[PDB]
Design a protein around this ligand. Structure first.
Ligand SMILES: [Mg+2]
Ligand SMILES: [Mg+2]
Ligand SMILES: [Mg+2]
Ligand SMILES: [Mg+2]
Length: 755
């Protein structure tokens, strides 16, 4: 480029910076092409072009001015890249702001989408504010290749689409530009199918939607509604390995954590809306907005000391009682809680408070509601046409056709969309088995095998691998968490090693072993010591997340206190012993709202949590217990650096079944960070109980779940114990401990203690 051109850009004299900035073809070679990417990055000293899907990264060079950058790259296609921008000591990674010079679909957009590889398809399908022919308006586009006609109906035309008939491109996608409308426009698509039947659909790629049970889509100027402040969070995330960090998740259903009064408006970020009543049966209650949740949930979680919030599905869904697991608006956060920018504010405030956001994401099916994706254009478009692979009959839902390019593209671009536009830090996928098996919940003679004669759903496996490959390429540092309940192998292993590419898997076996164990009267746990220890036998085959979820405190299963045997004191003590064991056992942690304060009732999705319980001491003490345990967890490296290495754990003794005692070490990089954990899972106290330890010295009683401030009896070792030179459990030294009833101790050597 010339210095004249560069200076036109620097000084805002250039007539159209997209001529020069962005990605431009320079020349074609025999088997490759030469491109240049240019960027004007005021205040950046350095920049790079990352090609994350090729695992490449190229520096940019200043050209004529220190903040004008160019990068020449030879490759056959340069469709997928990011800019890394360094401004002083800080780096950010962004999409190129000059990537798309028009709002309409290009030939290249259509080709990429037809092949299933358009990772940013949501920039062109849906509804986008823009300019065509010199006039501002909204561009709409929708994939409906077998429709006879499609028209845009909405507020702007009184729901009569005759003068807003779309134009079909390349026999596949319909488009229309509508001048002089903008964000907040309410619309649907009116489709006529091959039989002539006329019906109405919400936008598959819509970014916002009316409040259930109304279904119109709403235009969002998605890139001009919110200013983020989380660059330092995002940089730290990119440059860190979450597997080696504390990860303590507070699982939340946003619709049922806390309700407000329906007698007032729902406040939003700088505005308000009509209240959303929770149900006709509870009409004085309304949902809280994403704004109000930022103001209340976030400081609550920060005070409790969790590292992450995991949300049950927030994509738009028509029925509260699905809990979010039956989605019809994949590209929009539910309007129950306000607007897209209110959820952006929620995530930005989590990041400001050093809290990550994990979304439950639901790619496995969709319901049959007429407004949604079903039979979209008069053919089985999103779902497979064969009900033996295209329906989950026991659920009454439809299964995406994962092998169809445009359908795979809808879902793969959708997971990226939440990381891109909403900055989230992870996803969790429920019921991964539903996707992986062609015979899932199907009777003999009602499914067919794969091309090789097996029961593996090959197209679904390919799709899941693609999702996790892309996600970690574009957004290193995230969490991709699976619940898979059939022992499919290598769930949380890299795709190149034959894995599915998640980085964490819920340890459902552990959860069942634990909850079944603690439900047993303590005298009988001696016949079930194996429930305590078994899950370590397979532990290192996956990277496990120890999750006690919403699914375990519904449908007659009781909330945690109610699962426990004994009198009230003992029920609380069992909860504290179980959770202290959970937080000291190798693996990351997840627990669901209400578990942290001892709600007695099961979770009810139609009301809010029983907050009034926190007026009373026993509930206050249990919440203080979790607050302290989460603080300890973040403070003690041996509880998180080596979860997934042999080094990080070793049993001391797990043979004392008649007293339901087990003990173990956790370790980290520094030997002085090793912890001794001792568990007593009966109410019998032990005044003298010897435990083998590896070093001489004074072992401080770092945590004791029977402390009085947690509601316990305050039994224990009064600060700690000096080790005896008395060989025990095959170790050269040993502690003669007092074990409190229904309790866990954590001890730690203090090598500086004065004898
Ligand atoms: Mg009409
Ligand atoms: Mg399940
Ligand atoms: Mg058993
Ligand atoms: Mg209530």
């Amino acid at each position: 480029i010339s210095a004249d051109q560069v200076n036109q850009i620097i000084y805002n004299l250039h007539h159209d910076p997209f001529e020069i900035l962005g990605c431009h073809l320079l020349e074609e070679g025999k088997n490759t092409k030469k491109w240049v990417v240019r960027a004007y990055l005021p205040k950046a000293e350095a920049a790079w072009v990352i090609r994350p899907t090729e695992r490449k990264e190229d520096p940019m060079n200043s050209v004529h001015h220190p903040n004008f950058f160019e990068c020449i790259i030879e490759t056959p296609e340069l469709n997928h890249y990011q800019l890394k921008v360094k401004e002083g000591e800080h780096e950010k990674v962004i999409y190129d702001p000059y990537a798309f010079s028009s709002p309409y679909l290009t030939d290249e957009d259509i080709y990429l989408f037809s092949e299933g590889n358009h990772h940013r398809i949501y920039e062109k399908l849906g509804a986008h504010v823009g300019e065509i022919n010199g006039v501002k308006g909204v561009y709409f586009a929708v994939w409906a290749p077998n429709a006879r006609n499609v028209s845009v109906i909405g507020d702007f035309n009184n729901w009569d689409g005759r003068e807003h008939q779309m134009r079909k491109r390349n026999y596949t996608i319909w488009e229309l530009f509508v001048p002089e409308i903008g964000s907040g426009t309410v619309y649907k698509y009116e489709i006529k199918n091959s039989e002539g039947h006329i019906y109405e659909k919400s936008d598959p790629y819509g970014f916002y939607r009316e409040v259930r049970p109304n279904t119109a889509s709403i235009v969002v100027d998605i890139d001009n509604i919110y200013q983020w402040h989380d660059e330092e969070w995002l940089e730290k995330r990119r440059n860190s390995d979450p597997l080696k960090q504390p990860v303590s998740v507070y699982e939340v259903h946003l619709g049922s954590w806390l309700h407000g009064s329906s007698a007032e408006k729902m406040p939003l970020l700088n505005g308000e809306a009509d209240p959303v009543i929770v149900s006709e049966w509870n009409p004085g209650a309304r949902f809280l907005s994403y704004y109000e949740l930022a103001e209340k949930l976030i400081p609550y979680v920060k005070d409790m000391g969790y590292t992450h919030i995991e949300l049950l599905p927030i994509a738009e869904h028509p029925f509260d009682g699905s809990w979010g697991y039956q989605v019809t608006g994949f590209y929009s956060p539910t309007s129950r809680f306000g607007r897209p920018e209110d959820f952006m504010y929620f995530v930005d405030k989590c990041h400001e408070n050093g809290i990550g956001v994990i979304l439950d994401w639901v790619p496995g099916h969709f319901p049959k509601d007429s407004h949604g994706l079903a039979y979209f254009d008069g053919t089985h478009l999103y779902e497979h046409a064969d009900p033996r692979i295209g329906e989950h009959k026991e659920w009454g839902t439809l299964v995406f056709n994962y092998g169809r390019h445009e359908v795979r593209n809808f879902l793969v671009a959708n997971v990226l969309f939440w990381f891109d536009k909403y900055h989230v830090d992870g996803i969790r996928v429920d019921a991964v088995a539903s996707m992986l098996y062609r015979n899932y919940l199907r009777k003999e003679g009602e499914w067919i095998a794969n091309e090789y004669g097996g029961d593996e759903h090959i197209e679904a496996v390919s799709f899941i691998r693609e999702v996790n490959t892309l996600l970690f390429e574009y957004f290193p540092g995230i969490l991709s968490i699976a619940e898979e309940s059939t022992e499919w192998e290598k769930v949380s292993r890299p795709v190149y090693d034959g894995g599915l590419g998640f980085n964490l898997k819920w340890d459902m076996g552990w959860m069942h072993d634990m909850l079944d164990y603690f439900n047993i009267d303590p005298y009988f746990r001696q016949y079930h010591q194996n429930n305590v220890t078994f899950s370590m036998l397979y532990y290192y085959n996956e990277n496990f997340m120890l999750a006690l979820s919403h699914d375990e405190i519904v449908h007659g299963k009781s909330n945690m206190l109610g699962k426990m045997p004994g009198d009230e004191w003992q029920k609380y003590a069992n909860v504290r012993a179980l959770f202290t064991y959970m937080y000291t056992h190798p693996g990351k942690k997840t627990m669901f709202m209400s578990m942290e304060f001892g709600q007695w009732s099961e979770w009810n999705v139609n009301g809010d949590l029983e907050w009034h319980l926190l007026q009373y001491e026993p509930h206050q003490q249990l919440k203080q217990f979790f607050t302290d345990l989460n603080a300890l967890y973040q403070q003690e490296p041996a509880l998180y650096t080596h979860d997934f290495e042999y080094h990080g754990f070793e049993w001391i003794d797990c043979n004392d079944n008649t007293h339901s005692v087990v003990s173990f070490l956790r370790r980290s990089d520094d030997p002085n960070d090793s912890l001794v954990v001792v568990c007593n899972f009966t109410p019998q106290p032990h005044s003298h109980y010897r435990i083998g330890v590896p070093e001489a010295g004074y072992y401080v009683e770092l945590f004791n779940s029977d402390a009085k401030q947690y509601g316990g009896s305050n039994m224990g070792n009064l600060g700690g114990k000096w080790a005896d030179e008395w060989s025990f459990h095959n170790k050269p030294y040993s502690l003669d401990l007092c074990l409190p009833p229904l309790a866990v101790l954590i001890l730690k050597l203090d090598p500086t203690k004065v004898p």
